[PDB]
């Protein structure tokens, strides 16, 4: 069902679930902080 | 299920998203 | 994707490849939003000016992929479609307004380290994240340059959301609040864009409040790819989220 996947949506098993960052996501977060 | 042996260097279809007729 | 880089394994586990059955061709991107539902651009499925109108039996959805060409034994899933749902107000004649469609899989897909759904934005995600200069991420197997230019593996590029007036002034087409635009400005060094075959894929953003990835956009349209002074246009998922929920409630 749609609802069943909702609780864990958007959290990647090989990244957020292991507390690891991908190679370019810091650019995204930096755009919130220093990009404007 | 779909038999994967039915599949490899398939072409990419021309995409109207980057050539929309409303521009011509 | 123009001026992107190779995606890491598992980096975009909601990425879906839309693949034509006959003749065999890469068509578009898409995204996995639950175990049975895939989101894409309407013009990937229906474009009357080119006599495009796919039925459910014409297409496959390939989930979990990295390589554009290899069948990824052990990881990839190829799913058949039960039904396609086009937004009823999709405006292909004028400006691709409401360029959005949903596809229901015949069987649920098993999640894995390589296959996992993206979140849809809620009201406060959209409020917080859709601001000029904030970057989102686009991924796909589309061509590497405006047109063989095909990538070996999934590509990724991060692109800033652009001011509404800059988007409006960049094109003579009437744009609507059901789209936003993203890309770098001319003469500023970095560039990049989605391109042919990346349509229908997701423009995602990572929330700093809860560290989830949300799909804010769908790759929709542009004038060629990576042109100075032009931007990519993306279907605004939150603005269309009532329709998405209505379809899934009524048919899921
Ligand atoms: C697309 O094809 C299906 C099957 O023939 C048909 O039901 C539908 O009316 C067609 N849609 C358009 C816009 O031509
Ligand atoms: Na540009």
mmCIF file of N, CA and C in Angstrom, chain C residues 56-112:
data_model
loop_
_atom_site.group_PDB
_atom_site.id
_atom_site.type_symbol
_atom_site.label_atom_id
_atom_site.label_comp_id
_atom_site.label_asym_id
_atom_site.label_seq_id
_atom_site.Cartn_x
_atom_site.Cartn_y
_atom_site.Cartn_z
ATOM 1 N N UNK C 56 -0.702 0.651 -21.350
ATOM 2 C CA UNK C 56 0.036 -0.031 -20.308
ATOM 3 C C UNK C 56 0.915 -1.151 -20.833
ATOM 4 N N UNK C 57 0.500 -1.821 -21.897
ATOM 5 C CA UNK C 57 1.270 -2.934 -22.430
ATOM 6 C C UNK C 57 2.440 -2.503 -23.306
ATOM 7 N N UNK C 58 2.654 -1.202 -23.494
ATOM 8 C CA UNK C 58 3.698 -0.771 -24.405
ATOM 9 C C UNK C 58 5.014 -0.539 -23.717
ATOM 10 N N UNK C 59 5.030 -0.573 -22.377
ATOM 11 C CA UNK C 59 6.170 -0.045 -21.670
ATOM 12 C C UNK C 59 6.557 -0.991 -20.552
ATOM 13 N N UNK C 60 7.800 -0.866 -20.164
ATOM 14 C CA UNK C 60 8.286 -1.485 -18.922
ATOM 15 C C UNK C 60 8.836 -0.439 -18.008
ATOM 16 N N UNK C 61 8.817 -0.742 -16.701
ATOM 17 C CA UNK C 61 9.490 0.133 -15.740
ATOM 18 C C UNK C 61 10.612 -0.666 -15.115
ATOM 19 N N UNK C 62 11.803 -0.103 -15.134
ATOM 20 C CA UNK C 62 13.006 -0.803 -14.663
ATOM 21 C C UNK C 62 13.483 -0.038 -13.448
ATOM 22 N N UNK C 63 13.576 -0.744 -12.320
ATOM 23 C CA UNK C 63 13.774 -0.154 -10.993
ATOM 24 C C UNK C 63 15.076 -0.685 -10.435
ATOM 25 N N UNK C 64 15.782 0.113 -9.642
ATOM 26 C CA UNK C 64 17.036 -0.361 -9.051
ATOM 27 C C UNK C 64 18.269 -0.253 -9.916
ATOM 28 N N UNK C 65 18.196 0.430 -11.088
ATOM 29 C CA UNK C 65 19.305 0.428 -12.031
ATOM 30 C C UNK C 65 20.371 1.465 -11.756
ATOM 31 N N UNK C 66 21.542 1.155 -12.268
ATOM 32 C CA UNK C 66 22.708 2.030 -12.262
ATOM 33 C C UNK C 66 23.217 2.135 -13.692
ATOM 34 N N UNK C 67 23.662 1.002 -14.254
ATOM 35 C CA UNK C 67 24.062 0.947 -15.665
ATOM 36 C C UNK C 67 22.884 1.263 -16.572
ATOM 37 N N UNK C 68 23.133 2.057 -17.628
ATOM 38 C CA UNK C 68 22.075 2.304 -18.588
ATOM 39 C C UNK C 68 21.737 1.029 -19.387
ATOM 40 N N UNK C 69 22.720 0.181 -19.673
ATOM 41 C CA UNK C 69 22.556 -0.870 -20.673
ATOM 42 C C UNK C 69 22.522 -2.287 -20.119
ATOM 43 N N UNK C 70 23.223 -2.586 -19.023
ATOM 44 C CA UNK C 70 23.330 -3.976 -18.574
ATOM 45 C C UNK C 70 22.053 -4.286 -17.784
ATOM 46 N N UNK C 71 21.487 -5.474 -18.033
ATOM 47 C CA UNK C 71 20.509 -6.013 -17.083
ATOM 48 C C UNK C 71 21.222 -6.374 -15.787
ATOM 49 N N UNK C 72 20.860 -5.667 -14.723
ATOM 50 C CA UNK C 72 21.616 -5.741 -13.465
ATOM 51 C C UNK C 72 21.023 -6.860 -12.620
ATOM 52 N N UNK C 73 21.411 -8.073 -12.991
ATOM 53 C CA UNK C 73 21.143 -9.269 -12.221
ATOM 54 C C UNK C 73 21.284 -9.043 -10.711
ATOM 55 N N UNK C 74 20.303 -9.539 -9.974
ATOM 56 C CA UNK C 74 20.400 -9.553 -8.494
ATOM 57 C C UNK C 74 19.835 -8.280 -7.878
ATOM 58 N N UNK C 75 19.641 -7.240 -8.679
ATOM 59 C CA UNK C 75 19.360 -5.901 -8.182
ATOM 60 C C UNK C 75 18.193 -5.304 -8.930
ATOM 61 N N UNK C 76 18.300 -5.200 -10.255
ATOM 62 C CA UNK C 76 17.240 -4.547 -10.994
ATOM 63 C C UNK C 76 15.929 -5.333 -10.910
ATOM 64 N N UNK C 77 14.801 -4.621 -10.952
ATOM 65 C CA UNK C 77 13.477 -5.226 -11.102
ATOM 66 C C UNK C 77 12.797 -4.629 -12.334
ATOM 67 N N UNK C 78 12.268 -5.496 -13.200
ATOM 68 C CA UNK C 78 11.479 -5.020 -14.336
ATOM 69 C C UNK C 78 10.019 -5.292 -14.014
ATOM 70 N N UNK C 79 9.196 -4.254 -14.012
ATOM 71 C CA UNK C 79 7.806 -4.377 -13.604
ATOM 72 C C UNK C 79 6.940 -4.008 -14.799
ATOM 73 N N UNK C 80 5.794 -4.671 -14.918
ATOM 74 C CA UNK C 80 4.766 -4.333 -15.895
ATOM 75 C C UNK C 80 3.741 -3.399 -15.265
ATOM 76 N N UNK C 81 3.045 -2.659 -16.119
ATOM 77 C CA UNK C 81 2.088 -1.663 -15.686
ATOM 78 C C UNK C 81 0.665 -2.227 -15.702
ATOM 79 N N UNK C 82 -0.051 -1.931 -14.627
ATOM 80 C CA UNK C 82 -1.479 -2.198 -14.572
ATOM 81 C C UNK C 82 -2.261 -1.078 -15.231
ATOM 82 N N UNK C 83 -1.924 0.169 -14.942
ATOM 83 C CA UNK C 83 -2.731 1.276 -15.475
ATOM 84 C C UNK C 83 -1.908 2.556 -15.486
ATOM 85 N N UNK C 84 -2.137 3.410 -16.494
ATOM 86 C CA UNK C 84 -1.565 4.741 -16.587
ATOM 87 C C UNK C 84 -2.682 5.736 -16.323
ATOM 88 N N UNK C 85 -2.356 6.805 -15.586
ATOM 89 C CA UNK C 85 -3.268 7.904 -15.243
ATOM 90 C C UNK C 85 -2.596 9.219 -15.618
ATOM 91 N N UNK C 86 -3.149 9.909 -16.615
ATOM 92 C CA UNK C 86 -2.647 11.208 -17.075
ATOM 93 C C UNK C 86 -3.465 12.275 -16.357
ATOM 94 N N UNK C 87 -2.836 13.370 -15.933
ATOM 95 C CA UNK C 87 -3.625 14.444 -15.376
ATOM 96 C C UNK C 87 -4.626 14.898 -16.431
ATOM 97 N N UNK C 88 -5.904 15.044 -16.091
ATOM 98 C CA UNK C 88 -6.889 15.437 -17.123
ATOM 99 C C UNK C 88 -6.741 16.872 -17.669
ATOM 100 N N UNK C 89 -5.974 17.740 -17.003
ATOM 101 C CA UNK C 89 -5.775 19.084 -17.504
ATOM 102 C C UNK C 89 -4.367 19.291 -18.037
ATOM 103 N N UNK C 90 -3.646 18.211 -18.292
ATOM 104 C CA UNK C 90 -2.361 18.300 -18.960
ATOM 105 C C UNK C 90 -2.499 19.069 -20.271
ATOM 106 N N UNK C 91 -1.698 20.107 -20.408
ATOM 107 C CA UNK C 91 -1.816 21.044 -21.535
ATOM 108 C C UNK C 91 -0.584 20.900 -22.421
ATOM 109 N N UNK C 92 -0.612 19.903 -23.295
ATOM 110 C CA UNK C 92 0.509 19.706 -24.187
ATOM 111 C C UNK C 92 0.547 20.746 -25.328
ATOM 112 N N UNK C 93 -0.588 21.396 -25.663
ATOM 113 C CA UNK C 93 -0.646 22.298 -26.823
ATOM 114 C C UNK C 93 0.116 23.583 -26.561
ATOM 115 N N UNK C 94 0.005 24.132 -25.333
ATOM 116 C CA UNK C 94 0.433 25.519 -25.064
ATOM 117 C C UNK C 94 1.783 25.600 -24.358
ATOM 118 N N UNK C 95 1.943 24.852 -23.257
ATOM 119 C CA UNK C 95 3.122 25.075 -22.408
ATOM 120 C C UNK C 95 3.450 23.868 -21.536
ATOM 121 N N UNK C 96 2.889 22.693 -21.814
ATOM 122 C CA UNK C 96 3.106 21.511 -20.969
ATOM 123 C C UNK C 96 2.712 21.766 -19.515
ATOM 124 N N UNK C 97 1.715 22.628 -19.289
ATOM 125 C CA UNK C 97 1.189 22.745 -17.930
ATOM 126 C C UNK C 97 0.638 21.406 -17.445
ATOM 127 N N UNK C 98 0.874 21.123 -16.145
ATOM 128 C CA UNK C 98 0.364 19.896 -15.514
ATOM 129 C C UNK C 98 0.951 18.656 -16.165
ATOM 130 N N UNK C 99 2.262 18.697 -16.418
ATOM 131 C CA UNK C 99 2.966 17.609 -17.082
ATOM 132 C C UNK C 99 3.286 16.533 -16.026
ATOM 133 N N UNK C 100 2.295 15.680 -15.797
ATOM 134 C CA UNK C 100 2.359 14.740 -14.662
ATOM 135 C C UNK C 100 1.480 13.532 -15.018
ATOM 136 N N UNK C 101 1.966 12.330 -14.653
ATOM 137 C CA UNK C 101 1.206 11.112 -14.808
ATOM 138 C C UNK C 101 1.661 10.155 -13.725
ATOM 139 N N UNK C 102 0.749 9.253 -13.402
ATOM 140 C CA UNK C 102 1.020 8.170 -12.459
ATOM 141 C C UNK C 102 0.888 6.835 -13.195
ATOM 142 N N UNK C 103 1.704 5.840 -12.758
ATOM 143 C CA UNK C 103 1.633 4.500 -13.315
ATOM 144 C C UNK C 103 1.534 3.531 -12.146
ATOM 145 N N UNK C 104 0.555 2.635 -12.216
ATOM 146 C CA UNK C 104 0.348 1.632 -11.175
ATOM 147 C C UNK C 104 0.965 0.337 -11.661
ATOM 148 N N UNK C 105 1.867 -0.229 -10.845
ATOM 149 C CA UNK C 105 2.473 -1.529 -11.176
ATOM 150 C C UNK C 105 1.486 -2.679 -10.960
ATOM 151 N N UNK C 106 1.625 -3.734 -11.783
ATOM 152 C CA UNK C 106 0.772 -4.915 -11.651
ATOM 153 C C UNK C 106 1.001 -5.637 -10.331
ATOM 154 N N UNK C 107 2.234 -5.601 -9.830
ATOM 155 C CA UNK C 107 2.607 -6.263 -8.581
ATOM 156 C C UNK C 107 3.497 -5.331 -7.777
ATOM 157 N N UNK C 108 3.445 -5.401 -6.453
ATOM 158 C CA UNK C 108 4.317 -4.527 -5.659
ATOM 159 C C UNK C 108 5.770 -4.920 -5.829
ATOM 160 N N UNK C 109 6.643 -3.899 -5.776
ATOM 161 C CA UNK C 109 8.077 -4.135 -5.918
ATOM 162 C C UNK C 109 8.665 -4.269 -4.508
ATOM 163 N N UNK C 110 9.522 -5.267 -4.341
ATOM 164 C CA UNK C 110 10.227 -5.471 -3.068
ATOM 165 C C UNK C 110 11.294 -4.391 -2.920
ATOM 166 N N UNK C 111 11.256 -3.655 -1.824
ATOM 167 C CA UNK C 111 12.294 -2.689 -1.526
ATOM 168 C C UNK C 111 13.605 -3.388 -1.191
ATOM 169 N N UNK C 112 14.703 -2.640 -1.376
ATOM 170 C CA UNK C 112 16.034 -3.209 -1.124
ATOM 171 C C UNK C 112 16.970 -2.041 -0.914
#
